[PDB]
Design a protein around this ligand. Structure first.
Ligand code: NDP
Ligand code: FOL
Length: 151
């Protein structure tokens, strides 16, 4: 199984603001769609609320501790380990946040597909810091920039 993290962030690793994206970049959202299409996507419960509905054409997997919580069109597991365990037969799994999910996944992640933006936005939640000396930049397309890293 190839564990992959995908996230759009700024120079200070900001990702969210009051349970929302602090920006709107259609180019990044189209990039997110093509990358995630036809694959499992694991997300935190607040990230689902951020989206508002299941992402179409994709197996939406939602992590939560609420044991009676039901969600229409998503599979619910009670830990990241029960998610990865249930997707053992899968070839690739995509983690899309939020911060607590990203943090727990980072040490298990094989690949990273990250969008870095040359701007300083205001916010509250952030992407947890990786170690630049552990990763290798596979692809870097400068338009923001689509940055692919591989451990
Ligand atoms: N720019 C980007 O690429 C991204 C941005 N974001 C932004 O981040 C914000 C949402 O993310 P964030 O606020 O960090 O919250 P998260 O999406 O990380 O979700 C937190 C909640 O998910 C559940 N959860 C998380 N980890 C676990 C675990 N290990 N086991 C069981 N349950 C777990 C818990 O829900 P419960 O209380 O139900 O147990 C917890 O309260 C939004 O503003 C969104 O826009 C999010 C993803 C990507
Ligand atoms: N690179 C990247 N950018 C993001 O904005 C992003 N956002 C999340 C969490 N929040 C979101 C917010 C919006 C959509 C979303 O509307 N995506 C649609 C795009 C539809 C369209 O192109 O019009 C999708 O189909 O995936 C998904 C997740 C997780 N990873 C990300 N990764």
């Amino acid at each position: 199984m190839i564990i992959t993290l995908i996230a759009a962030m700024d120079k200070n690793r900001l990702i969210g603001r009051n349970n929302e994206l602090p920006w709107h970049l259609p180019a990044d959202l189209a990039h997110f769609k093509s990358i995630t299409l036809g694959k499992p996507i694991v997300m935190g419960r607040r990230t689902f609320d951020s989206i508002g509905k299941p992402l179409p054409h994709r197996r939406n997997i939602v992590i939560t501790q609420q044991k009676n919580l039901i969600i229409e069109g998503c599979d619910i597991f009670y830990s990241l380990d029960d998610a990865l365990s249930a997707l053992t037969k899968e070839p690739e799994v995509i983690i899309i946040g939020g911060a607590r999910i990203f943090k727990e996944a980072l040490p298990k992640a094989d690949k990273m597909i990250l969008t870095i933006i040359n701007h300083s936005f205001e916010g509250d939640v952030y992407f947890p810091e990786w170690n630049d000396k552990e990763w290798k930049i596979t692809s870097q397309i400068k338009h923001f920039q689509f940055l692919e890293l591989r451990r």
